[PDB]
Each structure stands twice: as C-alpha cells, then as structure tokens.
C-alpha cells in the first residue's frame, strides 16, 4: 500500500555475479541496519566463479558495496591415512544468506568434497558448506555437516542408506531466535532431503581452519527413510521457523518438499526433534507446492499463520485449458491444539509463466493498521513479463484477496525481479518497515521505503 515506488535505492554488483540472488537485513552491535547480499557467481582468485557476499551500508542513493571476505582456496588434509579435499569451484557462495544478531551466514550449496584412500574414494559430491562471519570482530567459522570420510564401496554394501554425499547443505537457511542455525539440504539421503541444525555459538567454538572434519556434538540432523513417498522430494528446498504447538519454550520448523510424493509436493511442520506435527499436501502435480514458505501472523490473533508458494500451479480456464500462473496458499493457525485445515485463502497468479508465489516475504505491519502484511513475487509476471511484486494486507479474516499495491520491475527483461524478497525491517528508521527486492538477473538490488499512508 504505502511503499514508495517513485524514489527507490539501487545497489549493484559485478556483472554476471548474480548479485541479488539472496539478501537479508543485518543489524550490528549498535543496531545500525545494513543489507547483506549474496552473489553466487562472483569471480574468485583463479578467475573462476566461486560466489561472494557483500555487506551494503544503508545510503539513500545506494551504489556499490564492499565484499564480506571469505576463504576461497581449495583445501587438502592428509590425515588418518586418508586425503580430505574441498573444492570451491562453482560452489555458489551466497546462494543463500541469513543474518542473526551480529552474525552473517552465507552458504555455498554446491561446494564439492571428496576423500581419497589409496585407489578408493568417497566420490566428489556437492555436500555444501556454510560460512559464518562476525563483521565487526572479524571472526570467521564454517559448518559443513554433510561431510564424511566413508568410502564409496561402503555405501554400496549398505544399500546407500544415510548417504549424505549430495546434501547441498545451505540450499536454504534459517536461524531461530535462540541462535540455532537450520540448514536445508534437498539432496540429503540420496535426494530425499534432510535438515541440519546446530547452535551458532557451537559452530564457532568448535571450528578451526585446516581440520575439515570436526565434531559439533550439539548438532542435529533429520532422518533417512525407506518410504518411496519421500524419494526425490527435495525435503529442505525451503525452510522457515515459527510457533505452531502452543508451547513457547519449543521452536517448530517448516520444511518445503516441492517434489514430495511423486511431484505432488508438500510442506511439513516439525518440532525441534524432527517429529512431524502437520503435513500439507500439494494441490497439483509439478506445481512445485513448497517452493517457498513463509511464517507470519496475518490476522492479529497472536498465532503464526502459514503461507505456501506453488509458482508453477496451472489454473483452470475456459474450454478445458490450463494456464501456468502460480499460486499461494494461506493457512491460519486454529485456536489451541488443532490441525491446520483447508487453505483459508487461495491467491492465484494472472500472468502466464509469471511464476506467482516464487517468493513470499512477511512485511510486518506496513500500513500500521494492526495486521501484518506480506509481499508475493512473480519474477516473470506483469504485462511486460519483467517481474512484479504484489503486496497483500492483513485483516481479521486473514488476508485481502486483492493486492493493496503492485511494484513493477525497474529493471530490464530477465532480471528475475522478485526472485528474492525481505521485509519487516525499518532500514531508514522512519518508523515504517521496508522492503528489499533482489534481481540477480540484473545483478542489482532495489530498496523500497515505506512512507506514511496517503489515503
């Protein structure tokens, strides 16, 4: 409704770096807000794409941003009669970023890893890895839970159980208020998908450079399965946290598995021990229900509601025809111990191949009326197909079925404007929460400032 579309702020990165693929707000010890942007195809030392992260200070004019430096050199450790190898070429550092406290977490989902032993090996596979940083103190650490030193032969003899060689840990990431990092690894357990969780404090204290394989006793990974309904579900394609069980001492997880049950798609809500509380199945095959998930209370009843994106949902149209437009589902949390029912609201896309619902961002209370609002991306929507972000306002009954505002892409075609969103933070400190929209296609980031309501 009251976002300012006339005077935007633009941040830009290197060409072809996909600057804007992922972003997030970041408050330092002094509460000064900055934007952290991921650029998964930024050039490394050997003029090879390794990815990179930028930490953009707030400035009404925007501009270029300083790099958040990380180690990009491949590592080798000959220990215990084995050779440990990390490969950072085309790892995609910055494929996702998340900020918690004064710490930044940037992930490289396709960082490869291998272990050699004489003529045998584990196999060079994308286990993924996360780089943690504390910009102010200069501290650095890493977390790579899916790494292992088991040789190929062993997996075959064990029928490929607990095979975490293709996790791609960091694909999606979230941090609980308590400070526990939660990484989604859609490739875990031979493409079933798994979650890895560990306290940030413990990730830092247990890490030392050069070790490559260290223990984090407090960590906790989800479980493998023999059920074909989970096969190639990419459980952990998207992740989020919230309160869905009444007990406030416990934190619940929300996991998207967009191809679960033979591409029917699904999203599940779990406890901290990965025990499933609820499961929401997709409405249509290949719609990619679960591509994105958002947790926020939109009807001001104090209870976190759930939003699920299905960017490829095909809508039924006259003469028995289907038009791929995308869809979002709203699930309002019921009073007390009860299961989430049917969707309370179905928001459906308009533009063909617009991919409405590819991203969903809680905005907080944008217009300051008492109900939280959200933003929904259609990276290839709009009459021009350049991208479009629609704002939906909260109300006592959930959400409004029609958008309060539509942000058309200021970039050229193919910018993927909206592929990443982030809101619910006052960046200019004007008392209204603001929105940052990524356009990795154009290697830029647009900042929309919320202003007092005109109407």
């Amino acid at each position, epitope marked *: 409704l009251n976002l300012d579309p006339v005077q935007l702020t633009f941040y830009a990165g290197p060409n072809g770096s996909q600057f804007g693929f992922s972003l997030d707000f970041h408050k330092d010890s002094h509460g000064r807000v900055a934007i952290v942007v991921g650029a998964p195809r930024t050039l490394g030392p050997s003029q090879e794409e390794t990815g990179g992260v930028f930490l953009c200070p707030w400035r009404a004019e925007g501009g270029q941003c300083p790099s958040l430096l990380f180690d990009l050199r491949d590592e080798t450790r*000959n*220990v215990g009669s084995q050779t440990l190898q990390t490969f950072k070429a085309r790892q995609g550092l910055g494929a996702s970023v998340v900020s918690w406290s004064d710490v930044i977490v940037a992930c490289a989902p396709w960082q490869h890893w291998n272990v050699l032993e004489k003529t045998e090996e584990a196999e060079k596979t994308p286990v993924g890895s996360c780089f943690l940083a504390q910009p102010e103190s200069g501290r650095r650490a890493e977390y790579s839970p899916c790494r292992g030193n088991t040789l190929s032969r062993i997996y075959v003899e064990n029928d490929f159980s607990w095979d975490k060689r293709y996790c791609e840990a960091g694909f999606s990431s979230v941090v609980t208020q308590a400070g526990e990092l939660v990484l989604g690894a859609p490739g875990g357990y031979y493409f079933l998908g798994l979650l890895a969780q560990a306290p940030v404090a413990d990730i830092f204290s247990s890490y030392r450079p050069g070790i490559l394989l260290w223990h984090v006793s407090s960590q906790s990974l989800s479980f493998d399965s023999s059920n074909p309904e989970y096969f190639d579900g990419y459980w952990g394609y998207s992740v989020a946290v919230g309160e869905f069980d009444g007990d406030l001492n416990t934190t619940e997880y929300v996991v998207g598995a967009p191809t679960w049950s033979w591409t029917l798609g699904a999203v599940e809500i779990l406890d901290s021990y990965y025990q499933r509380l609820h499961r929401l199945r997709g409405e249509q095959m290949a719609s990619y229900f679960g591509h994105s998930v958002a947790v926020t209370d939109v009807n001001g009843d104090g209870r976190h509601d759930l939003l699920v994106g299905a960017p490829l949902y095909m809508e039924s149209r006259a003469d028995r025809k289907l038009a791929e437009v995308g869809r979002v589902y709203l699930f309002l949390q019921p009073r007390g111990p009860h299961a989430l029912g049917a969707p309370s609201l179905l928001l459906t896309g308009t533009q063909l191949y617009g991919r409405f619902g590819s991203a969903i961002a809680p905005l907080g209370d944008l217009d300051r009326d008492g109900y939280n609002d959200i933003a929904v991306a259609a990276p290839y929507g709009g009459p021009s197909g350049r991208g479009q972000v629609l704002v939906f306002l909260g109300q006592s009954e959930g959400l409004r079925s029609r958008p309060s505002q539509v942000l058309d892409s200021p970039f050229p075609t193919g910018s993927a404007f909206g592929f990443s969103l982030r809101g619910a933070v006052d960046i200019d400190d004007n008392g209204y929460p603001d929105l940052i929209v990524g356009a990795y296609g154009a290697n830029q980031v647009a900042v929309y400032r919320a202003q007092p309501v005109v109407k």
Partner: antibody
Amino acid sequence: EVQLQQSGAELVKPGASVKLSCTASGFNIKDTYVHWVKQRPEQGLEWIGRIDPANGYTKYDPKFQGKATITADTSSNTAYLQLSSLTSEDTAVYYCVRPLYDYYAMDYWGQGTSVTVSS
Amino acid sequence: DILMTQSPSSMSVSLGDTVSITCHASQGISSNIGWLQQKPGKSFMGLIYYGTNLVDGVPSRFSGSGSGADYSLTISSLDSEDFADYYCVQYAQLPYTFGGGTKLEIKR
C-alpha cells in the same frame, strides 16, 4: 561433561581372556571414534586400534591383530576391548580415548584400567 | 609406521621457566600432531591438537608450534602442576604412534 568410565582393575592368569569396557558419560558413545591405547613403564604408549560405534567398523595396529578385539554397544553406551591368549607382556594399563573436535585427534582419555597376568 | 623421536627424555627446571619440548617424525605429518600430559599417578589430559590448537580448558601458557617433521610444545612460566610426563602423538598415518615421552622434574 565428557567422561569415560573404564572398568575396574583386572587380574587374570596366562592363557585367559579378559574384556575391558569404557562407558561414555555425558555424551553418546556413537558420536565419535573410540581408540584403545596400551601403556607400559618401559615400552611406553602403543596404539592398539579404534572403532566407530555407529557402524562398528574397526582398525588395528598389525601388532595386535588377533590379540585385541574392539567392539561397542550403542545401547549400553559402552565400548569394549577384549584380549585373548594373555601373557606376561600383556600386563599393562589400557586407556580408551576419543577426539574433542578434530575427527582424528586424541583429546579425551578414560581413567585407565590396570591389567595383570600372573599364575 | 611413523617413528616419533621425542627429546629430551627429561629435564630439570624451576618455576617460572619457559621450557620447550621437541618432537621429530620419520617423515612429514602436516601438523597432524597432538600433545598429551600425564600427571604422576593419574590419567592423561589433552593439551594440543592439530599442531597448535589448545584443547578446551588448557591454559594459554601452553602452545604448540612447528611444521613438516619437527614440532615443539612450549610452556611459558612453569607452574607447580606442570611438572609431569608429556607425550606427543601423530595421527597423520595409521597406526597412530607416540613419542618416547618427557618428564619435567624440579631442579635444586
């Protein structure tokens, strides 16, 4: 807190077979590797072997192959070291060890177990 | 098997002294070394792992250094408890191997 409670001192006769234990306290034995080390006054420290309690795979120094057999039961959260066809040279103090962070390191040690072989 | 020549076998020193034990391997071990301490009539304690990294709880007066096949544990400002046996261990190759050991004795 990580603690390795090893079994009480053993006293057996030559040719017998003893089985030592190393129960984990404050953590799941299944977490890390578990090594066994032998100490003698004159010969010093000698690595016997290790085991991964999660899957049960083991590794031995070819000096102990046949003599020593390392096992582990995740249920009782304990790791064992059995020695057969004992002799006077087997009279030594045995320690169970596990790493802190580094997968391959040897940081935490049990109190030890005194073994004596005599008729 | 990698041989660990640890010297000196023993040394007599006083409190506050800065002493250094050394370890030598039959071949390179890329900082894959660990230092241990065994107080008289007691079990072992971890000091250093992977060359230089202190085990949680160990005072900062301890420090591991060196590379290749030659490494050293250094104790700055000796304390009354520091008088005990110290061993080095390599885990670059199996089987793991230990050093001869070094007993710190009180001088007088």
